[PDB]
Amino acid sequence: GCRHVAIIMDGNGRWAKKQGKIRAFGHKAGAKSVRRAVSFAANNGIEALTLYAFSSENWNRPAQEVSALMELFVWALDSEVKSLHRHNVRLRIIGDTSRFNSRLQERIRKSEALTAGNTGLTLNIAANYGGRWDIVQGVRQLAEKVQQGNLQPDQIDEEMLNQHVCMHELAPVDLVIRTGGEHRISNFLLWQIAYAELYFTDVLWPDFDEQDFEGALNAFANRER
Amino acid sequence: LPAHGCRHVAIIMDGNGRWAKKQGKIRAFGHKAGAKSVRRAVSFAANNGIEALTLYAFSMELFVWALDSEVKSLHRHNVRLRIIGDTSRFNSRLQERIRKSEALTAGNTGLTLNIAANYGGRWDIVQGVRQLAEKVQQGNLQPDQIDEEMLNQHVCMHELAPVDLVIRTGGEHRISNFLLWQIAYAELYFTDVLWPDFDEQDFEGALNAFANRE
Ligand SMILES: [Mg+2]
Ligand SMILES: [Mg+2]
């Protein structure tokens, strides 16, 4: 009965160091773990899977290192989205994409447009995203309508604001998984997780596998509302 | 700032009913034992330098009862009492009692105790949004001036230290629409202990879990 899972994927760096390897090694292993989790979600009837890529916090890196990184993101979308499309996955990026360079904004738009008509798993990647920022964008949209004279303050209720927060057209989030050992939401989704099962595990992201995922789904199944 | 570093704790106090059922008693008995567990937790918080303690009362008899006989005690303990939630729905008498209790203790300088009654995290955000919408309608606020910090300044308890730790007893692992905006960075501590059995060592263990966060 679990329809939408969200994941905070911590642990890549510690995993690499524990293995006597550099951080990049842990990132490559982390991406394999993403592919594995997405296949698992799709193979088991989960309708939406939302992954926390990163907040809008500045990167502790040189402008050239950042520009290089953004092109690597362009390359990953170019290399892998066609397979996701054949697998009937709808890819959506949620978050402040205006902070990206123009080229990456366009490639995200193209990847979204290519898969928008798909009816399988909806994979949401939350990039330059924050739960409070998400709610604020919705509030700003409602405030504009009040300024126009198209909405009265007293008409704003939970349902109206819900229609203006990310993913409101998808199944509500049922389960949030955070790997890496910390017990916090860290301003990932906020509005959307009001009734979600929260599952914390010490397993590091690159090691998180199908057995770990099923364990989280079992926690959800054993909930008592 | 006491050495445990925790300024504001919030608690979802579940398990009262199950606790009573386990001993062949009606739910009311569990709620009374739950009220004793509240006195114990308030006393622990106050004696351990915690700045604020926020308890989820409900999203009526036992609440009305408390205000009539527990406020005097909170006052002698230098506790500042605040009710957060939609009280515009309560009978005019309960609203007045609430107002009187807060006025009496508003100037106390010890623990601030927030009781969430007829409270919901989404409702809290929405009431803040309506306040911003009234300012937009009154011509004092432009939509694009609205940012995180501004909305933060309009949700419940914005003037107190940020919530550091949320404790939920009773075995469930969710927020259940208790505080939402406020818990963005809070340590979340879930325990199977039923609320009437939550003791000082349990409270200590929760603070130790917070101290060990990374
Ligand atoms: Mg912890
Ligand atoms: Mg559970």
From Swiss-Prot, chain B:
Consequence of changing residue 50 to A: Formation predominantly of C(60) and C(65) polymers rather than the C(55) polymer
Cofactor, how bound (note): Binds 2 magnesium ions per subunit.
Result, substituting residue 111 to A: Formation predominantly of a C(70) polymer rather than the C(55) polymer
Site residues, Important for determining product length: 111
Family matches, as CDD domains: Cis_IPPS
Keyword set, alphabetical order: Cell cycle, Cell division, Cell shape, Cell wall biogenesis/degradation, Magnesium, Metal-binding, Peptidoglycan synthesis, Transferase
Regulation: Inhibited by bisphosphonates.
Site (Required for continued chain elongation): 57
Cofactor: Mg(2+)
Pfam families attached to this UniProt entry: Prenyltransf (PF01255)
Annotated residues for binding of Mg(2+): 14, 173, 187
Impact when changing residue 117 to V: No effect on polymer length
A GO MF label: magnesium ion binding
Residues of the active site: 14
Keyword Repeat: no
Entries under InterPro entries matching the protein: UPP_synth-like, UPP_synth-like_CS, UPP_synth-like_sf
One term under GO cellular component: cytoplasm
Sequence positions that bind isopentenyl diphosphate: 187
Family membership: Belongs to the UPP synthase family.
Purpose of the protein: Generates ditrans,octacis-undecaprenyl pyrophosphate (UPP) from isopentenyl pyrophosphate (IPP) and farnesyl diphosphate (FPP). UPP is the precursor of glycosyl carrier lipid in the biosynthesis of bacterial cell wall polysaccharide components such as peptidoglycan and lipopolysaccharide.
Quaternary structure and interacting proteins, as annotated: Homodimer.
Protein name: Ditrans,polycis-undecaprenyl-diphosphate synthase ((2E,6E)-farnesyl-diphosphate specific)
Organism the protein comes from: Escherichia coli (strain K12)
Taxonomic lineage: Bacteria, Pseudomonadati, Pseudomonadota, Gammaproteobacteria, Enterobacterales
